[model samples]
Target chain A: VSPPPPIADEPLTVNTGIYLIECYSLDDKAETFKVNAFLSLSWKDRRLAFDPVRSGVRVKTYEPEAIWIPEIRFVNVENARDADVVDISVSPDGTVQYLERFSARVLSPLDFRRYPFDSQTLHIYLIVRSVDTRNIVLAVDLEKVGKNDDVFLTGWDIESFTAVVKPANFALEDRLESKLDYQLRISRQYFSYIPNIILPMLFILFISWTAFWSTSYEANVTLVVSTLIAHIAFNILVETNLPKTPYMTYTGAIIFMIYLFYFVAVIEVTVQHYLKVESQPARAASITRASRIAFPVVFLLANIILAFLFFG
Target chain B: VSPPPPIADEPLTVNTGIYLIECYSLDDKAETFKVNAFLSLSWKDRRLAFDPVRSGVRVKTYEPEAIWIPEIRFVNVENARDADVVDISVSPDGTVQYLERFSARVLSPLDFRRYPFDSQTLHIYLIVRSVDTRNIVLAVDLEKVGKNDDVFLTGWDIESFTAVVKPANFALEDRLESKLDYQLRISRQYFSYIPNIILPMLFILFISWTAFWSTSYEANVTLVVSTLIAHIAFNILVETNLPKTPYMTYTGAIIFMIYLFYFVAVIEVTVQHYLKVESQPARAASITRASRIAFPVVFLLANIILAFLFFG
Candidate 1:
């Protein structure tokens, strides 16, 4: 079987639409996502035309192999999509409509610059090969392009599912091709990260500042360094949960920035001891008193700057 | 079309089997697992018989509507299974073989009693409804009850896929019914829990014992109380990752038991502090000396007991 012959010197424009049934498992590390959706395509074939009065039927169901259908595929999929032909209906005027439910693992890159506060645009590319006898082009049917209400992506909030109306028509490997881009927008949910990582980190950082309240060098070493130990554990915990990115993440920068405070606190504790041993008790006391204000002020101001730089 | 008339009075026997193609997303909280599999069914239909010499064919393909198929359904499914008929083949002897691919979310309860070291057997119940004119029963084709090599359940290890050959036939709503049980065996992957929660919790518990080596009352408070602070953090982290179970889990019991150790350590520290304050440094020193050995011995033996109770 072959495609329908055009009446004029025009290519056959096949109408296309997609309705998402399920979307799940957005794997951040693999840069892939799994989706189950319905794909609908329609084209006219005059060879299958019949009169309703004569046939006693307005539409007829046909086996997928009994009629000619375009070899549609996904460009960004890991393998050929797993698809089940749901229905194929032919109208009295020979308008053949095809619907299939398909599942695929789509390879769409993600940006983690802001990480826990990041948003991403995932893509799915649908394509059809053009035939030499009768060229086939694609056209979007916006009325049928929508997502199911029950569709959800865990740990992420879905924003929108929209298609680029115009097909990306181009030539590849000496063959003409038509591709459509479907975008799925989602934002990260930081409910788990806020209380578990951020608040705990800030609590430990503030605990290290308690070194300013006492002049005992041994007690201060026990206080400042112990908190530093906890921060190291937090660093390890955070890194293991995320992929190893080339560039720094929002959480990474903040975690690295706090290390400086710990190092500075150690230096302050040592300097106070040095001044006290040199019989300059007043100078040591003044330094300790000033650090009580300095550490809190600088820590608060630096966090505001970091937050704005990443999330503003 | 209707079913073929029986030669004898015996009910028709329909042989059935399932072959797993894919498995994923075993949700612990929902007590559900998703599966994609092939269902194969075979039955005899004498009316469709034909001679190979006359037909010039050994087997013929037929539309599902042109043949009679039993109403097969799943019992433990969240909703009706999504299935697509792949093929229907009829032999010269009128033996009809049907194949279909189906996807469904199976509701199988999970036991988290020994979580982090737990194994589960998930069940999928296949059923058939008997008709009025003739009764139908199900039988297992053991050859087809298997799984694909690529089958994987995230965070779990798949052990086996097998079927109970005997049908659970009974009467329902004054009608005869037959059911089959398919079991999928799996075990949890405790790799993440071992290094992340188990080791970190043990390390912090051991660190709290270090107060036995110090005589500084203030330093003891800082050491013992700081590690206690970290233990509380670990407690919250572990709880958040798992569902709220009515009974305690294996890890939960250990986490709860460690709290008493911290409280007792605080009492030991206070007792030593009180003794030194009453001008009994010698007695305080002896008590501190004995704790170092006492804490480690008790901790290691208690852990052995817990490990045996859960794993042995």
Candidate 2:
């Protein structure tokens, strides 16, 4: 069977609705989400148009092999979806209602620059390829598109799921193509990280500062060096949960800043050790007292700049 | 008519078993836990002794009016427990087998010194007052005392629920009292606080340090002062979840140390500002550079001393 012969050189309107039935496995490492949904498409063909007097029924049912369906596929999917045809029906006026329950793993890159406390619009691109007989464009029926009330994705705050009204058009491989953008808006459920990463970090960090109160260089070395190692442990633990991005993330910047603080502390410990050894204990103590004030002020100011740069 | 006639000059031993049913509402602010459980007590009352051969059944049930039941109370309970009697039986030799299901709000003094990483043995003191005729003492049967497997108290890692073998003998209000310790060992589920308090703290602390990088006192002032205010905000958020201890808590010591760092930074900011105004820019820069190393080293050492003091 072939597509209905066009009366004129006109484009075909294949409207669609993607109603999500289930959402799962939003893995960050793989940068993918496994989605299962109902994909409904409706289009018209003049050849399939019929008169009510001749038609035995108001709607005619047909198998997929019986009629021409648009070659609809996804652009961002790992592979073609596992689709089970739900129904194929034709109306007297030649409108075809095609529905399928499909599942696919969509590959989408997540932007994590504002991560840990970030919001994202995850996208799925749908495409249609055409032959000489017809040029196909996609349409969105907003009413038929929505998510199941029972949908659940742990540790994610799902906001909205919708498709763009406009279809992107281009010519590829000597054929006209259409692209539809399906965007899912979501924000991270981030509060769990506070106890996981924040408070224990403060305990380790404050202990590092105690080196300032100590007059003994021998114990000071132990304090500074040990805490520095602890910070390294903390950093490793923090990074274990995050992806290595090209640019510095919000948490990444802070982690790096802490490294710098630990390093500076090392420098001070070394310098003060020598200064006191050089009989310049007065200068060493003076600097140590001065440091109690200076390091924190600079630390405070640096955070302002980062905050302003990221979200101020 | 009164108590069972004493055969010797010995206190009565009332053995007990407490099997937990449901655990809920472990409120930190109220310093209380609402517990529901089965409390089974057994003691031989010779006065009710009978020959099982003469009785219709091996066990004979009785009403409270038929036998004398000793008073058992919890000293640490908010008030007395709301108790419902489950069963009461008299053995052939006047041994009383008593069982009851009870619920109570136990007022416990929770120690916050070790804080998020703390482990505690929450004590439930059961007491029995004595007169010249009857000196009641508490006992524990290791086999009968245990907790239900389905028991849960959210955010607490429950250890073992057990009672001490010996009773504490003390005189109160001119009368000798026997106290039995019912201890529930638990540890804090602590990892959640890291991102909440520590990582956020690092971000704020780093911003304060940026004042060292800035040559411009005006920008440095904004950075230092604003971050100090932010530290105050962070501190308030931290303290909100904790109790005020008479002695310095592990996290509290760190918090106090951080406050000192901020204060010293403010002092340095003022002194450096005056130094530049006094036309001693060279000395001001010297101290500023010196501070970078000294602050962190001192911070490190101070933390070590605290770690040693607390856990060493």
Candidate 3:
């Protein structure tokens, strides 16, 4: 079959329908290609498709999505030839669905300023129908080549759909005249994701450790109270990474355990401080009564809640 | 077609081929019966019929390599009623080949008395020749229901698999008899994973904090040395979770930066200690010479190498 007509600057819209075959170059350096493609229903599927592939092609329908292309390949040579297709579609209600970039190669680059380029572009769109799924694939084959020419296809931006809360935002006519400016900035800042999480944890832990060196019961109580506060902060942080389930995540449990330890330390210090200040028989009796009642109530309730929250 | 005769209890062996289905239960509570089966493939095709509808028959091949199935099913309800297949393939080989276990109801306990239980047990031995590569997929699909039942499919013992290098060690026969003794122990201990990792980290941070109150250069040096060791140890620990790319993971970079800060503190303390002891201009000059050269060389090289080893 003849190859699909090349798409230059013209915009083509698409929806959930299969299109003719297209070829793709896997690298930017030399001859390398993939032969298949798929479109999916979820944004996460596009995320997964961007993973490494030995050979394949894909088109996806989703908004607020990113592709995870592990590597890209390219080839350049004069008079080289490649086969490819641009897949395009549109919905019945005039909504734009998807777009694609396609390329392939058949030859190598020679002298500077003399290279083979087989570049193709695709514009696609999608419309969501109840209980409907669709896929489009393009097949390409190269037959002839020329000196200093590479028969190759290049370029694939698997994610080309924007998610809009309202369907009216996806007007096909507007899409035909629209252009997207994509920008990505890589940052090497230290502790970009985890440090902000861990720094507070460390701070709490340090405050707890200070309890070990406190010289007076009052100082110990103060230290432990601060540690408890720190522990609560960490507990919340740990929860963000954990599943909301009957069982606590390892991070969450550890934070909770540290909080319990701090609470116990605080209680012990409070009792000791009071006893040292007032050592009378009646006072000691009252202190013991309060401790007996409070310790069991607090500790037992805490353990029960913890066990239910984590394991029940 | 007639149903196959009853399977022998002893030898527990059945001849290879598809068999007519006799009976199955849709609901486990009543163990009620449904009787409709088809021999979907010829005897030669039995070699390829791993689909879970044909049970009461087994497929035979050469010994030590044969993949036998005690059951196969086409009906959705029958597959949901069977659990023996999922439990039997806990072998390392089963995992490496990417055997999949899906549940129909996420909350229902896996039940094993269902027909084709024996046949399903041997499905692990079935081999399908790949059209393009040696790698193949052993896939199963079932409805996902309930919550914790999802656990059966998610966690794997990656550490144990990494330790066993031999292919033979991963065989289904070996793993079938192997005890799943640690299943409960591991689940119970899940809450400890982060704490175990975090405690050592906190201990290391404490060593760094000791520098806060240290009275001498020796103490500062000791603190810095301990912190560095802790930093490296934590680097390895953190690597287990974060991607090893881009010259530095979030946790590793933070730890390294903290160590660098401590190292600078150590040098400062050393200079002050020397000046306090000697008060000589020549001694101060020598210290400056050493600091100016040593600081950048040792610190920068260490950070560079750590990043190289981590990301490279």
Candidate 3 per-residue lDDT over residues B1-312, each given as its tens digit: 222222322112121221222322334332233422211111212222233333335332111223433333221122233322211221211211112232232111122221111011101122222221112222221122112222221221111101111122122121121111111111112344456554576567555655534445445544554455445545445544433321224344545466445545544554545465565656655655665566546656866776566544
Whose lDDT is greatest here? 1
Runs with alpha carbons beyond 4 Å of true place in candidate 1: A44-54, A57-66, A133-135, A167-178, B1-218, B225-312
| DockQ of every candidate | 0.10, 0.01, 0.01
lDDT of 1 by residue, A96-148 (tens): 67877677888999888887777899987777777766678777887787684
State which docking tier applies to candidate 3.
Answer: incorrect
Lowest lDDT block of 10, candidate 2 chain A: A50-59
Q: Which has the better TM-score: candidate 1, or candidate 2?
A: 1
Please give, for residues B48-146, the per-residue lDDT of candidate 2 as tens digits. Answer: 343333457643656465566767667556335898887987666655678888988886767776787788777776765454456776678887777
Q: Is candidate 2 or candidate 3 better by TM-score?
A: 2
What order do candidates take by lDDT, descending? 1, 2, 3
DockQ of 2: 0.01
RMSD of 2: 22.3
TM-score each candidate. Answer: 0.62, 0.49, 0.23
